[PDB]
Design a protein around this ligand. Structure first.
Ligand SMILES: Nc1nc2c(ncn2[C@@H]2O[C@H](COP(=O)(O)OP(=O)(O)NP(=O)(O)O)[C@@H](O)[C@H]2O)c(=O)[nH]1
Ligand SMILES: [Mg+2]
Lengths: 44, 184
């Protein structure tokens, strides 16, 4: 396990990806310059 | 058991999907949008007992352009991003984040993460910083400012060379998995 003064619980382990979302927005403006967009937007 | 709430705020992934996403795929130098389909349901063993958390990602696409949870999250452990490349902006980031993260929430903790450190280490981008400074925020630097406000801790991570990823991101969720201890 992980272990870090917290019940020694293992962070988001593996096999944790079933895919349950829609979205899917083809390349609009890619990522040329840093400074990601706030979590309010996330993607372009 | 104890659960967690993965919510990142800022101009960087830090505690976003980029961690597990890029860790598996999606590529960094490609595009950023499809991720809008967050709310991924997973089933694994989160230390204690078989269970998984729910990372609710906010976006502005067809999925949900009306959402807005990052407004004033009542979380206890926020996620502050940054980058080694800095042309004398360090003074701004500090005086721009500390008063921001606290503005929305009366004094809200955070965690420093490293990633670009892999490339910024180059003497090229550095030269761009040289225009105003040149001093690259070393993995130890972020830790200094991070502890300055008793945030949490700056761990190693890289979405290009793979400097752990889960390590730093593990420290972010850790604050939610259980009350961690500082280093003083
Ligand atoms: N050094 C450093 N870099 C950071 C930090 N936070 C974010 N970054 C940079 O910001 C990038 C994150 O990209 P981002 O667009 O947020 O990821 P994503 O949106 O999850 N990917 P997707 O395209 O699937 O949505 C990383 O490659 C990293 O270099 C930080 O604390 N330190
Ligand atoms: Mg993403």
């Amino acid at each position: 396990g992980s272990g870090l003064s917290a019940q020694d619980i293992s962070q988001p382990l593996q096999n944790s990806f079933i895919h349950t979302g829609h979205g899917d927005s083809d390349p609009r403006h890619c990522w040329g310059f840093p400074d990601r967009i706030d979590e309010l937007y996330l993607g372009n | 058991m104890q659960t967690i709430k993965c919510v990142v705020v800022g101009d960087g992934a830090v505690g976003k999907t980029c961690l597990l996403i890029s860790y598996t795929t999606n590529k960094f130098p490609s595009e950023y949008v499809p991720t809008v389909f967050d709310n991924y349901a997973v089933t694994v063993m989160i230390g204690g007992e078989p269970y998984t958390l729910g990372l609710f990602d906010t976006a502005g696409l067809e999925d949900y352009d009306r959402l807005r949870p990052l407004s004033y999250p009542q979380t206890d452990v926020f996620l502050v991003c940054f980058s080694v490349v800095s042309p004398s902006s360090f003074e701004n980031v500090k005086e721009k984040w500390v008063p921001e993260i606290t503005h929305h929430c009366p004094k809200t903790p955070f965690l420093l993460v490293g990633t670009q450190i892999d490339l910024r280490d180059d003497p090229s981008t550095i030269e761009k910083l040289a225009k105003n400074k040149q001093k690259p925020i070393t993995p130890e630097t972020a830790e200094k400012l991070a502890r300055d406000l008793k945030a949490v801790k700056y761990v190693e991570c890289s979405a290009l060379t793979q400097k752990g990823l889960k390590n730093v991101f593990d420290e972010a969720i850790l604050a939610a998995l259980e009350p961690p201890e500082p280093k003083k």
